Design an enzyme around this catalytic site. Structure first.
Site, mmCIF file in Angstrom:
data_model
loop_
_atom_site.group_PDB
_atom_site.id
_atom_site.type_symbol
_atom_site.label_atom_id
_atom_site.label_comp_id
_atom_site.label_asym_id
_atom_site.label_seq_id
_atom_site.Cartn_x
_atom_site.Cartn_y
_atom_site.Cartn_z
ATOM 1 N N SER A 178 7.309 -7.871 -0.769
ATOM 2 C CA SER A 178 7.729 -7.688 0.151
ATOM 3 C C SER A 178 8.598 -6.280 0.937
ATOM 4 O O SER A 178 9.504 -6.409 0.029
ATOM 5 C CB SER A 178 8.666 -8.968 1.150
ATOM 6 O OG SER A 178 9.822 -7.893 2.207
ATOM 7 N N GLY A 179 8.257 -5.739 1.415
ATOM 8 C CA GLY A 179 9.030 -3.759 1.312
ATOM 9 C C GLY A 179 8.117 -3.096 0.766
ATOM 10 O O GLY A 179 9.240 -2.345 0.876
ATOM 11 N N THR A 183 1.858 -2.413 4.499
ATOM 12 C CA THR A 183 1.562 -1.922 5.320
ATOM 13 C C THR A 183 0.171 -0.648 6.134
ATOM 14 O O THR A 183 -0.003 -0.397 5.650
ATOM 15 C CB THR A 183 2.693 -2.337 6.785
ATOM 16 O OG1 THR A 183 2.747 -3.757 6.727
ATOM 17 C CG2 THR A 183 2.211 -1.742 8.140
ATOM 18 N N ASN A 229 13.386 -6.406 4.845
ATOM 19 C CA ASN A 229 11.949 -5.284 5.824
ATOM 20 C C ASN A 229 12.263 -4.595 7.043
ATOM 21 O O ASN A 229 12.503 -6.099 8.009
ATOM 22 C CB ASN A 229 10.971 -5.807 6.214
ATOM 23 C CG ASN A 229 9.963 -4.716 6.038
ATOM 24 O OD1 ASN A 229 8.939 -4.220 6.583
ATOM 25 N ND2 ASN A 229 8.903 -5.135 4.712
ATOM 26 N N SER A 232 9.095 -5.767 8.986
ATOM 27 C CA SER A 232 7.945 -7.264 7.979
ATOM 28 C C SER A 232 6.973 -7.769 8.475
ATOM 29 O O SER A 232 7.649 -8.132 10.181
ATOM 30 C CB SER A 232 9.690 -7.485 7.569
ATOM 31 O OG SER A 232 8.454 -9.256 6.327
ATOM 32 N N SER A 233 6.164 -7.557 8.073
ATOM 33 C CA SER A 233 4.469 -7.979 8.881
ATOM 34 C C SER A 233 5.387 -9.417 8.444
ATOM 35 O O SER A 233 5.016 -10.123 7.317
ATOM 36 C CB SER A 233 3.912 -7.091 7.848
ATOM 37 O OG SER A 233 3.440 -6.104 8.539
ATOM 38 N N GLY A 449 3.957 -10.391 2.143
ATOM 39 C CA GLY A 449 4.389 -10.229 0.488
ATOM 40 C C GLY A 449 5.202 -11.446 -0.118
ATOM 41 O O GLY A 449 6.152 -11.373 0.153
ATOM 42 N N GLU A 451 8.119 -12.561 -0.954
ATOM 43 C CA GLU A 451 9.566 -12.746 -0.644
ATOM 44 C C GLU A 451 10.353 -14.315 -1.116
ATOM 45 O O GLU A 451 9.025 -15.109 -1.681
ATOM 46 C CB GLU A 451 9.696 -13.199 0.775
ATOM 47 C CG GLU A 451 9.001 -14.110 1.241
ATOM 48 C CD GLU A 451 9.008 -13.546 2.599
ATOM 49 O OE1 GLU A 451 8.820 -12.619 3.368
ATOM 50 O OE2 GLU A 451 9.309 -15.379 3.201
HETATM 51 N N1 ADP Z 1 4.485 5.765 2.433
HETATM 52 C C1 ADP Z 1 5.552 5.607 3.271
HETATM 53 N N2 ADP Z 1 6.157 6.645 3.983
HETATM 54 C C2 ADP Z 1 7.024 5.992 4.596
HETATM 55 N N3 ADP Z 1 7.843 5.162 4.674
HETATM 56 C C3 ADP Z 1 7.531 3.678 3.682
HETATM 57 C C4 ADP Z 1 6.661 4.737 3.298
HETATM 58 N N4 ADP Z 1 5.358 3.024 2.591
HETATM 59 C C5 ADP Z 1 6.985 2.209 2.927
HETATM 60 N N5 ADP Z 1 7.641 2.801 3.381
HETATM 61 C C6 ADP Z 1 8.657 2.234 4.064
HETATM 62 O O1 ADP Z 1 9.445 1.249 3.758
HETATM 63 C C7 ADP Z 1 9.200 0.169 4.848
HETATM 64 C C8 ADP Z 1 8.522 -0.916 4.408
HETATM 65 O O2 ADP Z 1 7.111 -0.421 4.150
HETATM 66 P P1 ADP Z 1 6.103 -1.346 4.514
HETATM 67 O O3 ADP Z 1 4.686 -0.621 4.124
HETATM 68 O O4 ADP Z 1 6.594 -2.339 5.487
HETATM 69 O O5 ADP Z 1 6.305 -2.907 3.535
HETATM 70 P P2 ADP Z 1 5.162 -3.990 3.039
HETATM 71 O O6 ADP Z 1 4.359 -3.936 3.988
HETATM 72 O O7 ADP Z 1 4.857 -3.663 1.913
HETATM 73 O O8 ADP Z 1 6.115 -5.070 3.065
HETATM 74 C C9 ADP Z 1 8.254 0.842 6.234
HETATM 75 O O9 ADP Z 1 8.999 0.287 6.935
HETATM 76 C C10 ADP Z 1 8.675 2.314 5.870
HETATM 77 O O10 ADP Z 1 10.281 2.343 6.568
HETATM 78 F F1 BEF Z 2 7.560 -7.489 3.546
HETATM 79 BE BE1 BEF Z 2 5.780 -6.916 3.459
HETATM 80 F F2 BEF Z 2 5.495 -7.254 4.494
HETATM 81 F F3 BEF Z 2 4.900 -7.362 2.455
HETATM 82 MG MG MG Z 3 3.397 -5.997 5.275
#
Ligand code: ADP
Ligand code: BEF
Ligand code: MG
Lengths: 781, 148
Positions: A178-179, A183, A229, A232-233, A449, A451
């Site tokens: 997570s983070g 996404t 996040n 966060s999804s 992810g 957490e």
């Molecule tokens: N390629 C990227 N470009 C810009 N910001 C990113 C990128 N990947 C992640 N982030 C940033 O980090 C935060 C967490 O990314 P996210 O895709 O939501 O993570 P995950 O889905 O793995 O939990 C995003 O909201 C954004 O601020």
């Molecule tokens: F917080 Be991420 F979407 F796993």
């Molecule tokens: Mg996500």
């Protein structure tokens, strides 16, 4: 010796056009420069001053510090000829440190998307890099793997053509905790396909226009700010795009998983509920606001931490944005407003608090103001709902026992009502959307992810649970599975155990029959009368107390908890109120009162209410029963991993945590992945096809007769004097080494270009003379 | 070129111009030549054009009279592809010797090898040859463009 690239291209490509400096090359003499430990850097270069046998004396080439260590604490350094290499499989020296370095460089240099064997690393930038645009989309279209640099758009195209080529549906799965990015990477993949397979600003198809407004909706009420996040999804996601026989998009579907609504009632410290709540409370209008009964932000007890602000985001405009998204789709003017009122009504149910009568112990509704304002949003009867939620006119079937619950159970029921009347809605939308965005199909898995907080509720269990499942999948399809095809075909191979299997830590929470799993146990144990959060825990040890991946809670402060030895770490879950939700208890009294409410929308919401609890399946198995569906189709498609890696826990960009990043790499089976890639023959091809393609490159090889595809192919390979070590021969298929096929592919392409140019010209002529004939006709008309 | 055909040549040429300066845009030359039943490669034309630049190509002129020398010169060359070899290369893409390739295999190729034809060119070119399974028999596609 190549082209010049702007500050922007200095984020996709690298800076090679430099002086053949003999400085870095001169020092090559002190090849005794190796790697070594660190508390702040993790690793660092240092040269051997004296090899004292099993222990060698060394001095880091940084602080001139003479830190000596064992002859097994050092690490082979790679030539400076590799500094910031594209495909880490190319590094001549593979180390836990080597790879860390590379990632160190390219990250801090603006490049994140790296390549690791078959899969690809993708550290989080946390910055707004200008590497995504209508332009870059173009630059990669049709562009092979090496014919361009590692990028998300790159994987999208590689996967897409692979599907179209070998006719074999595909899947791109972003791992990581997570983070880390999961996404965004998915969005990029979709954004790219939306234009790269259609039929910044650009004129896409009609469904692609909506297929674009799919995730900006599910993110609204589904995604929310946590302490790791800002957005966060808060659930699982699986987008499936359906291509035709001409590789064009025609349909798309999403399968939503684990909508953690459990936070809709009371969100943790420094967190918020499903964004949409605030987007409305602020995006609504004085009129509309008065049309659904929505008050202030610190007015609702449903919004813990009062009101939290999300950086670089204005829910005020955010609302408008999300509103615009719905419309693009098909959510009529009303069709939207109808959903809106529901939200405010759900928030309201939060103000409905009971005064446990001292006299009778039965809750009380002193000031009905609350309830009155919620019913008018449901379309149900005031008095009716009031009594139903209050005095349950229960129906045990074998009787009609009318009872009354305390203020508590009175509250616990209205809570599990609002909280589920929302999820009743989440899935409403998802299937409202999935109706519009709908031979081949591409799969995009946006799961959740790993957490781990201070209070590890049930939800967080199946969450991390899913992670471990996907993690196992990787290891399997990577090291495990693959090796199998080596054995099967017979190629001169040998097994190598990469030490990567979480089957155990899964059964500890999976297998029902035979030793039961953490969930299996909770399952039935919850059907019991004298069953409690507690009782459960003890049962767990009563049988699993002897599992490595299992461990007895260290602190039983006051309550009961337990921790598991996951692949991603250990987490001390608090079994409290577990069985309390595994059954999904709820006041069905009001439930059917809703089923026949005036609010058609809310009527249609609970229209099919023949599964409610008034006394079928347990959440646990209901899940693993669908999360089993998943892994059934996945194993039936082609995996394409996008290993997103979190950089640091400071939520600050430009910072790259050493070890953290280093361990993630280890607990993601990176190094091992690269091992198999370069160790074995990660490529194969049935005779027929191999000889079918690469023959024009070997004309004078095979006689005129129709002979064995094996011996025919052998003759071909022999002609091009292929080194008996890049490829491995089998029963009916060849196992070539990496890129050993790309060469054949390029050579073959070269040996036909002209002809392609010649015919291309002929086709142009036809085209030219044909169009011009039609325009000529208009004039005459 | 003959006087009778050369006269018609002029017609076809002036039929290629919006306003009326009687000038064929520098870029608007290829199609003019082809229309006259010529299949000059996307090279020859450029070679005879002194190799102008895209910028100047959109703002350059060419009188029918000026065009004449180019027409014949181009009309007279040495080689021209045909079935024998044309398809030959098209065959190489044969899934498993289906004597017919797909709509993507073809489209992709014709737009990633040499003188790349735009998405359109490829799409509208074969548009109608791909069947249910979306296959386009080459040993018949090439002919449609050649003999056609
Ligand atoms: N390629 C990227 N470009 C810009 N910001 C990113 C990128 N990947 C992640 N982030 C940033 O980090 C935060 C967490 O990314 P996210 O895709 O939501 O993570 P995950 O889905 O793995 O939990 C995003 O909201 C954004 O601020
Ligand atoms: F917080 Be991420 F979407 F796993
Ligand atoms: Mg996500």
């Amino acid at each position: 010796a190549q082209k010049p690239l702007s500050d922007d291209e200095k984020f996709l490509f690298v800076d090679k056009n430099f002086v053949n400096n003999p400085l870095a090359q001169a020092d090559w003499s002190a090849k005794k420069l190796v790697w070594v430990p660190s508390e702040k850097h993790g690793f660092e270069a240092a040269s051997i001053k004296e090899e004292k046998g099993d222990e060698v004396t060394v001095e880091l080439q940084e602080n001139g510090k003479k830190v000596t260590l064992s002859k097994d604490d050092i690490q082979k350094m790679n030539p400076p000829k590799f500094s910031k290499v594209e495909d880490m499989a190319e590094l001549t020296c593979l180390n836990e440190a080597s790879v860390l370095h590379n990632l160190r460089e390219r990250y801090f240099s603006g490049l994140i998307y790296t390549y690791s064997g078959l899969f690809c690393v993708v550290i989080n930038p946390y910055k707004q890099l200008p590497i995504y645009s209508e332009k870059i989309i173009d630059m990669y279209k049709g562009k092979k793997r090496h014919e361009m640099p590692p990028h998300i758009y790159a994987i999208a195209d590689t996967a897409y053509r692979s599907m179209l080529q070998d006719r074999e549906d595909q899947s791109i799965l972003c791992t990581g905790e997570s983070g880390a990015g999961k996404t965004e990477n998915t969005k990029k993949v979709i954004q790219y396909l939306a234009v790269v397979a259609s039929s910044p600003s650009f004129s896409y198809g009609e469904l692609e226009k909506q297929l674009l407004q799919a995730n900006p909706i599910l993110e609204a009420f589904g995604n929310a700010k946590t302490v790791k996040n800002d957005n966060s999804s808060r659930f699982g996601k699986f987008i499936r795009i359906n291509f035709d026989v001409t590789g064009y998009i025609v349909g798309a579907n999403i399968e939503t998983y684990l909508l953690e609504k459990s936070r809709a009632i009371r969100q943790a410290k420094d967190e918020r509920t499903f964004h949409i709540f605030y987007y409305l409370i602020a995006g609504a209008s004085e009129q509309m606001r008065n049309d659904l009964l929505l008050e202030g932000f610190n007015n609702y007890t449903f919004l813990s931490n009062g009101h939290v602000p999300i950086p670089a985001q204005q829910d005020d405009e955010m609302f408008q944005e999300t509103l615009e998204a719905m419309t693009i789709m098909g959510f009529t003017e009303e069709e939207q407003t109808s959903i809106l009122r529901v939200v405010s009504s759900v928030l309201q149910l939060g103000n409905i608090v009971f005064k446990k009568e001292r006299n009778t112990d039965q809750a009380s509704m002193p000031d009905n103001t609350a309830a009155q304002k919620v019913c008018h949003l449901m379309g149900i009867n005031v008095t009716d709902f009031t009594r139903s939620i209050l005095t349950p006119r229960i129906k045990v079937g074998r009787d009609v026992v009318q009872k009354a619950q305390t203020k508590e159970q009175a509250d616990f029921a209205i809570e599990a009502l609002a909280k589920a009347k929302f999820e009743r809605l989440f899935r409403w939308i998802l299937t409202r959307v999935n109706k519009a965005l709908d031979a081949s199909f591409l799969g995009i898995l946006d799961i959740a992810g790993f957490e781990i907080f201070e209070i590890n509720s049930f939800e967080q269990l199946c969450i991390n649970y899913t992670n471990e499942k996907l993690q196992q999948l990787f290891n399997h399809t990577m090291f495990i599975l693959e090796q199998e095809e080596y054995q099967r075909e017979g190629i001169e191979w040998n097994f190598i155990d990469f030490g990567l299997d979480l089957q155990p830590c899964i059964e500890l929470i999976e297998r029902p029959t035979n030793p039961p799993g953490v969930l299996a146990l909770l399952d039935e144990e919850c059907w019991f009368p004298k069953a409690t959060d507690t009782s459960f825990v003890e049962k767990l040890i009563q049988e699993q107390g002897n599992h490595a991946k299992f461990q007895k809670s260290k602190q039983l402060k006051d309550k009961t908890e337990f921790c598991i030895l996951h692949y991603a770490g250990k987490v001390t879950y608090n079994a409290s109120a577990w069985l309390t939700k595994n059954m999904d208890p709820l006041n069905d009294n009001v439930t059917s009162l809703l089923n026949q409410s005036s609010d058609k929308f809310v009527a249609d919401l609970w229209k099919d209410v023949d599964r409610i609890v008034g006394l079928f399946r347990t959440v646990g198995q209901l899940y693993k029963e669908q999360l089993t569906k998943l892994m059934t189709t996945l194993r039936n498609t082609n995996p394409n991993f996008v290993r997103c890696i979190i950089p640091n826990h400071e939520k600050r960009a430009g910072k790259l945590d050493a070890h953290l990043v280093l361990e993630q790499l280890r607990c993601n089976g990176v190094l091992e992945g690269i091992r198999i890639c370069r160790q074995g023959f990660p490529n194969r091809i049935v005779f027929q096809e191999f000889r079918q393609r690469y023959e024009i490159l070997a004309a004078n090889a095979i006689p005129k007769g129709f002979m064995d595809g094996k011996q025919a192919c052998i003759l071909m390979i022999k002609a091009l004097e292929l080194d008996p070590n890049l490829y491995r021969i089998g029963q009916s298929k060849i196992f070539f080494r990496t890129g050993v096929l790309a060469h054949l592919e390029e050579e073959r392409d070269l040996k036909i270009t002209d002809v392609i140019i010649a015919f291309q010209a002929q086709c142009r002529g036809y085209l030219a003379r044909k169009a011009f004939a039609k325009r000529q006709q208009q004039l005459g008309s | 070129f003959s006087e009778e055909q050369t006269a018609e040549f002029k017609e076809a040429f002036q039929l290629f111009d919006r306003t009326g300066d009687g000038k064929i845009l520098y870029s608007q030359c290829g199609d003019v030549m082809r229309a006259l039943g010529q299949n000059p490669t996307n090279a020859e034309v450029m070679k005879v054009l002194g190799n102008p630049k895209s910028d100047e190509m959109n703002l350059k002129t060419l009188k029918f009279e000026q065009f004449l020398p180019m027409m014949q010169t181009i009309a007279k060359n040495k080689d021209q592809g045909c079935f024998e070899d044309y398809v030959e290369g098209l065959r190489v893409f044969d899934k498993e010797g289906n004597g017919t390739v797909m709509g993507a295999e073809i489209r992709h190729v014709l737009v990633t090898l040499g003188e790349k034809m735009t998405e359109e060119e490829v799409e509208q070119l074969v548009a109608g040859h791909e069947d249910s399974n979306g296959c386009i028999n080459y040993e018949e596609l090439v002919r449609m463009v050649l003999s056609g």
